[PDB]
Symmetry: none
Amino acid sequence: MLLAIDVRNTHTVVGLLSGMKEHAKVVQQWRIRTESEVTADELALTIDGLIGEDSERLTGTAALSTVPSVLHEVRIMLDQYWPSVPHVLIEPGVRTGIPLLVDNPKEVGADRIVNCLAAYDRFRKAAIVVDFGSSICVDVVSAKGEFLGGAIAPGVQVSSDAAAARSAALRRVELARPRSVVGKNTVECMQAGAVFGFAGLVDGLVGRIREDVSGFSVDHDVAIVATGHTAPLLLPELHTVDHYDQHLTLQGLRLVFERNL
Amino acid sequence: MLLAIDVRNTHTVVGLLSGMKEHAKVVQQWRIRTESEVTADELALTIDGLIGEDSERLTGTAALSTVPSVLHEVRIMLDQYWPSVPHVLIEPGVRTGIPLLVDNPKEVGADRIVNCLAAYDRFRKAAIVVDFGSSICVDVVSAKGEFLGGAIAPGVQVSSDAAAARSAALRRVELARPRSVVGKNTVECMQAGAVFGFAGLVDGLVGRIREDVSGFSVDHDVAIVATGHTAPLLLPELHTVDHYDQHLTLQGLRLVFERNL
Amino acid sequence: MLLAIDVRNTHTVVGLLSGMKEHAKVVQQWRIRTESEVTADELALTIDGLIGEDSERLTGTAALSTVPSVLHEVRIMLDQYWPSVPHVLIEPGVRTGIPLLVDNPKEVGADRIVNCLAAYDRFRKAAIVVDFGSSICVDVVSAKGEFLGGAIAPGVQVSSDAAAARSAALRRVELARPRSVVGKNTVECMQAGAVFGFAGLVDGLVGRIREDVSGFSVDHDVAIVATGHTAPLLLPELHTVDHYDQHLTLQGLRLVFERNL
Amino acid sequence: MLLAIDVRNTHTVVGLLSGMKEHAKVVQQWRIRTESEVTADELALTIDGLIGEDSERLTGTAALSTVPSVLHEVRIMLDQYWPSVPHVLIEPGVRTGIPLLVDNPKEVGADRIVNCLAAYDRFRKAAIVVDFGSSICVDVVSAKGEFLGGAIAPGVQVSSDAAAARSAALRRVELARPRSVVGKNTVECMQAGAVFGFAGLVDGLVGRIREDVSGFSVDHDVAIVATGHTAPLLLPELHTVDHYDQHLTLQGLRLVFERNL
């Protein structure tokens, strides 16, 4: 009933969301590769091919893009293909209800704003969002709902592919958990490094934020939530992340659409 | 008087060693780039340019490499331009006094064997060596000198560069310590990510190794020492690492040179 | 009813033309990407997906291509899938009623000749056609219908992308009009640069053409018309160009098809 | 007696400046390819090889980099190789006497700040600096010395190379002035575009700044100075550029160094 487009640097998530507010659920979600040079007509063609007969029952469209060229094409596609269907676009510089206590609010990403909005809507307290995308984005949200910033670490698959690409000896290894941390072969050592090390990266970032920033200590109530496609892989090994929400960006886009109408 | 060569994927470290056994110290160290396609001519030229008047005062030449082509070029330049000076060459698959209790001892990197030898010689107990190179290599050495294994995490600079390149909104940033873990701008966010996240990554790998492996527990006596160019930057943040030894690879090259003659 | 194909180096424009001569009006225009490696099957599939039920009502097909392989694929897909439909294929070196007064008429691109023919058909005087594609192509047409030449500057979007990619501080930016020519941040400065600078580029090329060429001065009667996707973006800024005609290349294909039967 | 390093995204300028204040002149200048991966020791070796015997007579060193990695290496090289010699480094966003009335001063390039300081020192009035770098940077300086911002347009050679690289028919041609604006073949049209269109780009940007920004109009006294390697190529074809100072960045580096003692 609602079409949500979420364009990341690596993959795009298309979602059909039905219901309103508390009853709002992601009834369907597809994940496709993104091309930076795709045009409005190609994008509308593949979106219609995905959503099938639902295209005539759409009641709204909400989109964000971290790639600016794809954001341009999304502007043209939303203005052209679904005129009667109301549309909202997440453009940097426009408030979405979450204050940005950061030096340069105009260059904060769209995904981070949406994730912070969704997390503070769900938990209504201090939160640490760990988005497992092309980068691992750690977002810190105060108890009052501000965005204090965070950290942008390299992602797991991106860093592993870069490490394998630098060395001709190393090959592209699938991201999976090994037997133990101390591997016994190059594949096992690389997998142990990427998986246990990036779990330790997330844990160290979260623990450092809790130690160094007031209001986020262990004596405080902090909702530490993961999201992103690779989050379930590192989720068992994390000791600091409590909750997991695969549709946090989609629910944030839904909240943006509901507040803009 | 001892020319120690350390060839990695991205940077090569050349050192001069004066003395022998305990009296062997590093008097001069230089860090240059590496080219997989460079030949013995340019390599001999830059070695001469770095060492100055010491080209005619060398006593021995110890080398290790990870790129096979660079190792072959080192072979040809040592056999051509330094016929009188004896050389020791370290390739993966040759014993250096540390037994390689691993499934595939042939494929273990030469830097790992050399660092394990140097750390076991220095401490004579269970050792944990973190080497911050192109890839963060974690190695564990038994209390009797057996090389068990470890992990191969992505490097700090390589991962940060990959994150900068893959993302349009992310730019290349200088690797440095920011004011806090919570960045207030994109530069500070990416710096906090690369620095504190990788400090947490190394802490996680070391802690999981100590918890999940027999003989490496807290109650045991384990020497945990970091090396590498980025090691002084991440060292104030590492909680599980005590010592720093900038010349551990060079000292291991010296030890191999003294053992192989 | 007439299937018009305009193949460029970056985007291919496919149009449906309804009517003939003065009554020929474009009702549907679709912009898709182009692939140098594409074959007839995928091209036929996307063409059919674009045109829907209109695939069975085609009267004629007109094709222009600046890529040779794409033109060959169009030949094979028209021969295979539309046997009964007459087809006109435009390649450089064949007259279309416009004498190519050029030192090497073979090297002149097909899109330039088609736009020149369309503009001389519409205006019937001296013309300056500005075509914003992969490269900003300015062409000049005499008062008697000869094609003299022009200039080929780089395109707005291609050059802005190259500027973003070649610089570490510069990031990829959505091509848009800013508040002022003087920017206050990197994104605003790059948008001001790209948009206003390429407006100045086109203005300078047109002015230099008019002043340095006989018959094109201000005292004469010359029509200056813009075409291209980015042309509506630079149109408020250009002071030399008077007219905009979005369908000029498709109308030129219609004219060529009507002439060559 | 003063060594100045100016690292840009494509070329580095090394300069020896003798004398102080008004009596300070650039006695020698070298231009080398920049390497984002170069190390401190290689950079010091090439600086010594360029400057010959002057390394033992230097009184000061001053450096800037637009590449963060090369900036890190420059930090290490200045700390290591010339310890007695005082040094100043341009970390972007730090006051040099020119206030940055920009949204985020820490992102303004080092080259822009240095060029603005040199231009205001030499001319002492409202200025427009057109740096012909890897990108054409237009910097506006108030009559009170403030840096109000400007524009970052794609560079001439980068845009021409992108346009040639997109198309197989278009090749990499020399950047020279053609016989006329209206070319007679593909090479002549491409060169006409590259030269005259970017001359028009610079002229249109400068004219729009003068028309649309208060204090910079024709009735105001404005110094319009070019700098950079490709500035003399378009200098004959420009109407708005008055002066040409080829040593603007080196003189600005000297001015910053003298202000820091």
